[PDB]
């Protein structure tokens, strides 16, 4: 039906296993290294567990202006630095 | 705690009550072996 | 039987980021908190 090889025949094929015993660990390792090296925090701007609050303040860094929100976020990140 | 002479088999006891649940799963495994006929 | 089908594309665009994300979430499970 439809001209594609059946899923059962694909997943039971030894060749499918020998391709997918390498690629899947490679992607899993890529994701683990994305989180464990801390690249995800820098890419997505998610605060680290010691980077929610500044050392002196305990005010939540809400952005309050539409066109200065980028500079406001950068100011918060500088004050935690 | 358990009596001390049994303490070396303390991890085994830690997994003992879960064994009947696996029995249920085993039935499906058995049916998977026979093609659910 | 071809390999580079539309089904292959759909399966892999849902499959490759799934494993990347699962590795990411496991590495999250080993964060010290």
């Amino acid at each position: 039906t439809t001209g594609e090889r059946p899923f059962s025949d694909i997943i039971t094929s030894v060749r499918y296993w020998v391709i997918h015993s390498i690629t899947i660990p490679a992607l899993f390792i890529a994701g683990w290294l994305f989180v464990s090296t801390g690249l995800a925090y820098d890419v997505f701007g998610t605060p680290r567990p010691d980077s929610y609050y500044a050392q002196e303040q305990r005010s939540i860094p809400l952005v309050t202006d539409r066109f200065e929100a980028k500079q406001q976020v950068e100011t918060f990140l500088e004050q935690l630095k | 705690k358990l009596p001390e002479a049994y303490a070396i088999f303390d991890p085994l006891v830690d997994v003992l009550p879960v064994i009947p649940v696996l029995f249920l799963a085993l039935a499906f495994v058995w049916q998977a072996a026979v093609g659910f006929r | 039987y071809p390999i580079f089908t539309v089904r292959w594309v759909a399966v892999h665009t849902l499959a490759v980021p799934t494993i990347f994300f699962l590795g990411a979430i496991a590495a999250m499970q080993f964060i010290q908190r």
Binding site: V14 | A32 | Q29
Partner: peptide, 28 residues
């Protein structure tokens, strides 16, 4: 070839250990 029930059981055990890992991380 590999029997289909072997593949199904292996995938089920893998999904069970990933769920158990997530629940262990939840309780930790």
């Amino acid at each position: 070839r590999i029997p289909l029930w072997i593949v199904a059981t292996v995938a089920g055990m893998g999904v069970i250990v990933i769920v158990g890992l997530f629940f262990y991380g939840a309780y930790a």
